[PDB]
Amino acid sequence: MADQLTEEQIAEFKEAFSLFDKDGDGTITTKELGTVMRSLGQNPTEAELQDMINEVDADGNGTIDFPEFLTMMARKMKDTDSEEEIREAFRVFDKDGNGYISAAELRHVMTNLGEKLTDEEVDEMIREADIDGDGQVNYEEFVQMMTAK
Amino acid sequence: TPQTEKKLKEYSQKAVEILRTQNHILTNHPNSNIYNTLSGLVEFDGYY
């Protein structure tokens, strides 16, 4: 799955990993895992970091080696998000599973995020997210929204 | 010495350039404020 990555990128990933290796065993700790790819020019968030360590460190040891580091890296430079990821985001937005993201579900997901907005603003963003004129966001609308550049 | 116009312009340009550079040196000197204030209050010989 990592064959799409050119050899120089693997070489520079190895350089970064080795420089970030502490005890010389080719294995690092997850506390500095953010700094490793954070030093390569890409900028993640804390939720990004926690999710990345969750996906790989299933055993909970907190220690990363090279092949699985390449596994993590190979899914970062992709620009077109995988349709599974978009559909999963749709499902998270669609709490009731009815396929239509109403305003109230948006309010719930935004309040859980800790962010606050007025009713008018969320209605405004919903109506600018609508193309069919029904004021309701569906899967095709979400897909064409995330593909807009 | 009687001299041509171009030489006169060169000479005047050199003089004015030196004067301007020294003025710029004086007005941005790190110790310029201290010396300028001390000049009118105390009597001193050199810049210590």
């Binding site: 900028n43 405004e124 963003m125 600018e128 929204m145 807009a148 | 790190p30 404020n33």
Partner: protein
């Protein structure tokens, strides 16, 4: 939110990317006074949390 700012009227936040020439270098190395340098050092230290 990014798309809304791109098409609608919401303001677009700036990106955390700093210029390499600024007033900061001027203040940090001024030889006119030392308190200016120390205050600039305190400010930039506080800016990095």
């Amino acid at each position: 939110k990014q798309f809304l700012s791109r098409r609608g009227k919401r303001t677009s936040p700036l990106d955390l990317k700093l210029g390499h020439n600024n007033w900061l270098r001027q203040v940090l190395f001024t030889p006119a006074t030392q308190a200016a340098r120390q205050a600039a050092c305190t400010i930039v230290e506080a800016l990095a949390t």
